[PDB]
């Protein structure tokens, strides 16, 4: 009744949730699935209450009646006077990254190169990039643009999974969850750092968070920003400090979604939950922090300051914005539970 059932995607996320459930005294319990879409089915079924989602999945859920409840908010310099829970969300920059040593690689010479995506159906890792590529290309054969890629979610036998690696033993190749070495923002970036792929479709924050000694992770401790470049849409190549003038798009922050007849309940518990394990919670540092997972973005991106109220009690289309919504629609033209 006053308890929330969260849906975790994959084994690593289920571990962090179990910990969260334990520290909350059952105020929050977990449900597990192997993929985000399965997590959405559980929520529709009623066996799970909520889960945080990238804009790409919100589109999907939205059609199935789910609704955004709260959104993640990272630290910004403008809009200082206002608290985090009430402050407007700015969204993030989807960028295309490359190794600087890869001279001559530009947005115009990407065909047949090797791409690293966060996962199919995600904003910065799939929808924005393949969206632009389907339009400029005029074709729907985005499955043939790149020679080889790693796009968690696609057919394991296809070229779109050729570069993925699976887990420690090579099992779960290409599964859209943290078990895949190259899954998500971090996964896709590693995919480039290790020179597996030629280009990685992530977000501006990912580069910074994993370069210049910010990650301490063995595959990223020796990473230096200067050795990276962004691919702008005009054919130019700018430093990672010029993200504001060289990005593919601004994307809507990830957000917690739930069934509408529960949104109120999910919100109440969450706000309270975050006042205890949030950025400045009564018990985050000492006992448990909802927004930490040592660079893996488990349940929430590690750069989340807090979960913000929406205000305007927005529908999923409104939340995602008309801009992004068409982009997705146009792309989906090329391809219950896809509830319309
Ligand atoms: C692209 O993405 C990057 C990464 O998110 C953005 O860079 C961050 O931007 C913020 C806001 O402009 C900037 O403000 C400072 O935040 C610091 C915390 O990161 C604060 O102090 C510093 O904290 C560091 C982290 O603990 C610490 O290592 C350092 O010693 C110092 O204490 C500071 O008070 C400011 O608020 C961040 O510094 C910056 N973070 C990083 C890692 O660079 C960047 O703005 C994005 N670009 C665009 C176009 O949006
Ligand atoms: C890929 O190409 C498609 C096809 O053009 C792009 O869709 C088009 O997107 C623009 C801008 O979002 C739409 O224009 C808007 O039209 C509405 C009224 O329909 C108007 O009120 C706005 O001021 C604006 O002019 C356009 O309608 C839409 N075309 C169709 C038929 O869907 C799509 O955005 C491109 N995708 C990417 C990732 O760039
Ligand atoms: C777990 O959730 C319960 C329910 O909200 C919390 O207990 C409540 O504490 C507030 C503040 O004292 C009271 O207004 C409620 O009446 C209490 N619930 C009841 C009916 O006993 C509890 O604080 C939460 N603990 C954790 C770890 O999150
Ligand atoms: C114009 C713009 O910045 N795009 C916004 C994005 O920042 C925001 O996160 C999202 C959710 O409302 O809606 C988009 O339209
Ligand atoms: Fe995203
Ligand atoms: Zn822009
Ligand atoms: Zn409205």
UniProtKB/Swiss-Prot annotation:
Residues covered by the Transferrin-like domain: 4-333
Locations listed in the record: Secreted; Cytoplasmic granule
Post-translational note: Poly-N-acetyllactosaminic carbohydrate moiety seems to be needed for TLR4 activation.
UniProt binding sites for hydrogencarbonate 2: 118, 122, 124-125
Residues holding Fe(3+) 2: 54, 92, 185, 254
Family: Belongs to the transferrin family.
Function: Transferrins are iron binding transport proteins which can bind two Fe(3+) ions in association with the binding of an anion, usually bicarbonate. Lactoferricin binds to the bacterial surface and is crucial for the bactericidal functions. Has some antiviral activity against papillomavirus infection. N-terminal region shows strong antifungal activity against C.albicans. Contains two BBXB heparin-binding consensus sequences that appear to form the predominate functional GAG-binding site.
Subunit structure: Monomer. Found in a complex with LTF, CLU, EPPIN and SEMG1. Found in a complex with MPO and LTF; interacts directly with CP, allows Fe(3+) incorporation into LTF and activation of CP ferroxidase activity.
Protein name, entry field: Lactotransferrin
Gene source species: Bos taurus (Bovine)
Underlying gene: LTF
């Amino acid at each position: 009744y006053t308890r929330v059932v969260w849906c975790a995607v994959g084994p690593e996320e289920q571990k962090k949730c179990q910990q969260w459930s334990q520290q909350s005294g059952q105020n929050v319990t977990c449900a597990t699935a192997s993929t985000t879409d399965d997590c959405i089915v559980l929520v529709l079924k009623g066996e799970a209450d909520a889960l945080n989602l990238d804009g790409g999945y919100i589109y999907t859920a939205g059609k199935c009646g789910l609704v955004p409840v709260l959104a993640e908010n990272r630290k910004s310099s403008k809009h200082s006077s206002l608290d985090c829970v009430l402050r407007p969300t700015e969204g993030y920059l989807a960028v295309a990254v490359v190794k600087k040593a890869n001279e001559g690689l530009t947005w115009n010479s990407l065909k047949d190169k090797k791409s690293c995506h966060t996962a199919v159906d995600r904003t910065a890792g799939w929808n924005i990039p393949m969206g632009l590529i389907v339009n400029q290309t005029g074709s729907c054969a985005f499955d043939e643009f790149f020679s080889q890629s790693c796009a968690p979610g696609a057919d394991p036998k296809s070229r779109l999974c050729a570069l993925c690696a699976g887990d420690d033993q090579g099992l779960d190749k290409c599964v859209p969850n943290s078990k895949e070495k190259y899954y998500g923002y971090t996964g896709a970036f590693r995919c480039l750092a290790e020179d597996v792929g030629d280009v990685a479709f992530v977000k501006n924050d990912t580069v910074w968070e994993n370069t210049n000694g910010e990650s301490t992770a063995d595959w990223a401790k020796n990473l230096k920003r200067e050795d990276f470049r962004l691919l702008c849409l005009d054919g130019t190549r700018k430093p990672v400090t010029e993200a504001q003038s060289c990005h593919l798009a601004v994307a809507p922050n990830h957000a917690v979604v739930s069934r509408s007849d529960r949104a109120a309940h999910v919100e109440q518990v969450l706000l309270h939950q975050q006042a205890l394990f949030g950025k400045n919670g009564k018990n985050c540092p000492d006992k448990f922090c909802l927004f930490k997972s040592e660079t893996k973005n488990l349940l929430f991106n590690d750069n989340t300051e807090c979960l913000a109220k929406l205000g305007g009690r927005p529908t999923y289309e409104e939340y995602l914005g008309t801009e992004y919504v068409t982009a997705i629609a146009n792309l989906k033209k090329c391809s219950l539970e896809a509830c319309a």
